[PDB]
Amino acid sequence: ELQEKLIAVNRVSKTVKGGRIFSFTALTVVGDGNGRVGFGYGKAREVPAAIQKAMEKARRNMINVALNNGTLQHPVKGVHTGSRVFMQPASEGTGIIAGGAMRAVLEVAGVHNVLAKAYGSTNPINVVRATIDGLENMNSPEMVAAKRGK
Template identity: 35%
Template sequence: MNFNMEEWEPRTNLGRLVKEGVITSIDEIFEEGHPIMELEIIDALLPDLEEEVIDVNLVQRMHKSGRKVNFRVIVAVGNRDGYVGLGQGKAREVGPAIRKAVDDAKFNLIKVRRGCGDWGCVCGREHTVPFKVSGKSGSVRVTLIPAPGGVGLAIGDVGKTIMRLAGIDDVWSHTRGQTQTTVNFARATFDALKQLSKVKASEKDLKNLGVCST
């Protein structure tokens, strides 16, 4: 669905500031810690987000009127340049479930720290993770390790999709647990990327690692 700025009628003060051009970057919102309550804000500031369906599954539950069957969909969104989100949606049909998952992923959008964190690589580009970090979900634990340029994405297919959407070209990884559980693998990978912003480092160290200040 194409976003039309002219037809958008903001319902929040933050939305009005975006539409009026007072706020022109998603970074301004993240840095101030403002909650995003309207999807149109993300559509306006990050119009180039791509969507990838990670997993589609049938889920059943018993109800007094009988067995209820829904589709559960996991979707990742990203602009391949430092922003990525992961979301889930449920509905009786696949299409609406995907739409819900995409919206959820946009609300869960994060900015990913990137750099040149491998000491054997001095290219200075933002092509890998700047630090070793780990994330977990359920029994799955994913550790991301900086890699030199040209290594590629040494991680499972689900992780590859999330890394590409985040704009990471090279990474080593180590996984533990039931990694064949797609949902937990995706969430653990996403959690590891979230941990990047929590690592404390001096401006000098960040500059040496090729990380742009956030």
């Protein structure tokens, strides 16, 4: 009962010699209801085929986000060129008011409580490529204990 969504595409079609040339791309995400989320990209000759090549790529294992229980405990660095980025937790009862430009990165696993919209760039490819690499760099509730003792 896994979860599957897209977020972006290019109009990618140009003048050449010569008439017109065309191509077809995607950027997609997947998730498991036990706090697991993932992403990737595809290309094809056909549009619903550039979605499939993407979503088969997003199915790679899906990172377990530190979610205890309806919210999360630390804003991980989504480091990028100038995006910046930092999420803002909310106190376990109020909803996923985050950037619909990328929100499917947190929505596909069910996560009820987190916000922040897209603080330094209104291009999804930028706040996507940033978010997933902060989510792999995280720490469990159990790790931060060791980080501050033994």
